[PDB]
């Protein structure tokens, strides 16, 4: 039971999506080719793999993911890499062009030719499975394939399935620096259609995951493949209450009342607490009374703004490992007495724990040392309004001459979105704080 769909669309999330499927196959006995390695072959007693995988009778296990992107290059190394012996080769849809950052090159001109194929697979997977729980869509916010092309594939399941959950795992646009030049303009494209459907997100950027690599990790000047593993870990902690049972486990339908107060504030943080090497884990003990605070450190949270100007609204300390529940309320009552962690005045409910009994999952080929404890922190905070304050303002200083619009109007897109979405983006930033200080 308790299964979920993991489509990996757009280049950023399909490459982090290449990084999750190492991690699941390591936890169980599933090899890349799906055969248990001639010993520790199950008779069939357990059903631990059913959240993310499925079984074909020969002994080979089959995953549940779909790799779609119109780019031909990036899917082509999972048909020839170390993981070609894993998927189903009808899941893999390739194509002819990239995004080229044009909204109609993912929603009106090129993405309209591929839509009967991609809808006929998410319903093909779901009829084999018993009782569904949510979606795991891996899309970033930049391009016309990351952000233009998830809005086409979010707007059709939510009229197909209706009341299913949505979860996402990718990179937020940094406020200061980026790579794609039309990215100030670009994210507001997905928010016209994917705010009444989206119930989950990612809050902050890959910029600050460089700096955890500097300090807590003992590495100097990392790549992008270190980004993919650390984002890949918190995937296996949110989805750990669906095949591994503990004290307090949450299915993915409960999060649309945990974390969404009003219909337009629906996003988490992500913070793995003991992200440290061997050379510091040997020196330091890491009990529960500090890995709760290590989540609430201004450094270790993934945020490129000040947390000290933020008031935490609905945190959710999802623990995991060898933990004992007296240590938790010894640690949370420690937290709400601390004056610097300011909260929301009209919600003393606030916290929401989750306890489980499997260790942190290492993967060989990395920095990590083994720790007995780890904890995720999905936390809806206040301060991120400052980050949406500059991103639509980043649209506003090329708004005079309307630079870069010559290809949107060139290929299949109108100007009509570019004012209505901005005031709707202005409607999103005002609504954290037009309710932020009312009942005084």
């Amino acid at each position: 039971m308790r299964e979920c769909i993991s489509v990996h669309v757009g280049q950023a999330g399909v490459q982090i999506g290449n990084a999750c499927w190492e991690l699941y196959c390591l936890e169980h006995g599933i090899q890349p080719d799906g055969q248990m390695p001639s010993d520790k072959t199950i008779g069939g007693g357990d059903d631990s793999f059913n959240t993310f995988f499925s079984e074909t009778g020969a002994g080979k296990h089959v995953p549940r993911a779909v790799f779609v992107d119109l780019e031909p290059t990036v899917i082509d190394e999972v048909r020839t890499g170390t993981y070609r012996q894993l998927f189903h080769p009808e899941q893999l849809i390739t194509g002819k062009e990239d995004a080229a950052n044009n909204y109609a090159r993912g929603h009106y001109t090129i993405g309209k030719e591929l839509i009967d194929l991609v809808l006929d697979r998410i319903r093909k997977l779901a009829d084999q499975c018993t009782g569904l729980q949510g979606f795991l869509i891996f899309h970033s916010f930049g391009g016309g394939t990351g952000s233009g092309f998830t809005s086409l594939l979010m707007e059709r399941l939510s009229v197909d399935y209706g009341k299913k959950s949505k979860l996402e795992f990718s990179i937020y646009p940094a406020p200061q620096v980026s790579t794609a030049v039309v990215e100030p303009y670009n994210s507001i494209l997905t928010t016209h259609t994917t705010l009444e459907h989206s119930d989950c997100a990612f809050m902050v950027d890959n910029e600050a995951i460089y700096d955890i690599c500097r300090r807590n990790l003992d590495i100097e000047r990392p790549t992008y493949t270190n980004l993919n593993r650390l984002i890949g870990q918190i995937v296996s902690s949110i989805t750990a209450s669906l095949r591994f049972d503990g004290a307090l486990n949450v299915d993915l339908t409960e999060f649309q009342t945990n974390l969404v107060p009003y219909p337009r504030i629906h996003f988490p943080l992500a913070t793995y607490a003991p992200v440290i090497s061997a050379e510091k884990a040997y020196h330091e003990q890491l009990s529960v009374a500090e890995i709760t605070n290590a989540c609430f450190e201004p450094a270790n949270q993934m945020v490129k703004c000040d947390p000290r100007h933020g008031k935490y609204m609905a945190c959710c300390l999802l623990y995991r490992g060898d933990v004992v529940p007296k240590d938790v309320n010894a640690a949370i009552a420690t937290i709400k007495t601390k004056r610097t962690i300011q909260f929301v005045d009209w919600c003393p409910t606030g916290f929401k724990v989750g306890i489980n009994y499997q260790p942190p999952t290492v993967v060989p080929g990395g920095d990590l040392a083994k720790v007995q404890r780890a904890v995720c922190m999905l936390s809806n905070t206040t301060a991120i309004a400052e980050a949406w304050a500059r991103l639509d303002h980043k649209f506003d200083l090329m708004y005079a001459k309307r630079a870069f619009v010559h290809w949107y109007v060139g290929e299949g897109m109108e100007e009509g979105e570019f004012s209505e979405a901005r005031e709707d983006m202005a409607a999103l930033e005002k609504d954290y704080e037009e309710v932020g200080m009312d009942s005084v």
Partner: protein, 53 residues
Amino acid sequence: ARDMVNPPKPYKEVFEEAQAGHDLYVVSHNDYFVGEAKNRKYDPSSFHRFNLY
């Protein structure tokens, strides 16, 4: 010679000649590598790379 923007070197010889400083480079400057950690020396019994810690 007309061609020095693409000098005639094989990939293995290029890699082996470019990884020339064995230990002197990281001591004498911050010799960055793409995705590599820092290894302070440790005693034999004390620090294992991954053990019960």
